[PDB]
Amino acid sequence: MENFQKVEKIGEGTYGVVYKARNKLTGEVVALKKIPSTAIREISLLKELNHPNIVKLLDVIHTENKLYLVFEFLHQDLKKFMDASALTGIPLPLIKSYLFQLLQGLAFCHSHRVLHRDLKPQNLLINTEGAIKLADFGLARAFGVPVRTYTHEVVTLWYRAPEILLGCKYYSTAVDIWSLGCIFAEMVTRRALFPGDSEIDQLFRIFRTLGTPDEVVWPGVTSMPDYKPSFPKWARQDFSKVVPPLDEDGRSLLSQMLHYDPNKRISAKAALAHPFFQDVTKPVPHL
Ligand SMILES: Cc1cc(NC(=O)c2ccc(Br)cc2)n[nH]1
Ligand code: NA
Ligand code: NA
Ligand code: NA
Ligand code: NA
Ligand code: NA
Strand partners, 141: none
Q: Are residues 120 and 71 in the same domain?
A: no
Determine the Cα–Cα distance for residues 258 and 174; give it in Å rounded to an integer: 9
What phi and psi values does residue 152 have, to the nearest 5 degrees? 80, 0
Ligand 1, atom 12, lies closest to the CA of: 76
Angle of helix 174-189 versus helix 248-257 axis, rounded to 10: 140
Say how many Å lie between the CA of residue 59 and the centre of ligand 2: 5
Would you say 136 is a known binding-site residue? yes
Determine the Cα–Cα distance for residues 174 and 25; give it in Å rounded to an integer: 41
Q: Judge whether 77 and 125 are in contact, CB under 8 Å.
A: yes
Sign of the C-alpha dihedral computed for residues 238, 257, 177 and 106 taken in this order: negative
Say how many Å lie between the CA of residue 79 and the centre of ligand 4: 5
Determine the Cα–Cα distance for residues 170 and 176; give it in Å rounded to an integer: 13
Those residues whose beta carbon sits under 5 angstroms from the ion ligand 6 are: 247
Q: Are residues 131 and 10 in the same domain?
A: no
Determine the Cα–Cα distance for residues 193 and 159; give it in Å rounded to an integer: 9
The contacts of residue 83 (CB under 8 Å, 6+ apart) are none
Q: Judge whether 282 and 195 are in contact, CB under 8 Å.
A: no
Neighbours of 125 (CB within 10 A): 22
Determine the Cα–Cα distance for residues 197 and 61; give it in Å rounded to an integer: 35
Q: Are residues 159 and 34 in the same domain?
A: no
Would you say 264 is a known binding-site residue? no
Q: What is the DSSP string of 9-55?
A: EEEE-SSSEEEEEEETTT--EEEEEE--HHHHHHHHHGGG---TTB-
Q: Are residues 104 and 114 in the same domain?
A: yes
Strand partners, 9: 19
Determine the Cα–Cα distance for residues 212 and 93; give it in Å rounded to an integer: 33
Ligand nearest to the CA of 123: 1
Domain hosting 55: range is: 1-75
Neighbours of 120 (CB within 10 A): 23
Last residue of a domain, one of 11, 46, 75: 75
- Resolution in Å, one decimal, please: 1.3
Say how many Å lie between the CA of residue 247 and the centre of ligand 6: 6
Substitution site in 10, 80, 126 for ligand 1 pocket (most atoms within 8 Å of beta carbon): 10
CATH of the domain at 2: 3.30.200.20
Angle of helix 92-111 versus helix 174-189 axis, rounded to 10: 170
- Give me the sheet containing 132-134, strands edge to edge: 76-77, 124-126, 132-134
Would you say 26 is a known binding-site residue? no
Nearest to 216 by CA among 259, 248, 174: 259
What phi and psi values does residue 224 have, to the nearest 5 degrees? -70, 150
Last residue of a domain, one of 16, 43, 75: 75
61 in helix, strand or coil?
strand
Determine the Cα–Cα distance for residues 214 and 197; give it in Å rounded to an integer: 24
φ/ψ bin of 242: left (φ > 0), alpha (ψ from -120 to 50), beta (otherwise): alpha
Q: Judge whether 173 and 115 are in contact, CB under 8 Å.
A: yes
Determine the Cα–Cα distance for residues 42 and 142; give it in Å rounded to an integer: 6
Q: Are residues 68 and 81 in the same domain?
A: no
Give how many domains the chain has, as a whole number: 2
103 in helix, strand or coil?
helix
Determine the Cα–Cα distance for residues 21 and 3; give it in Å rounded to an integer: 10
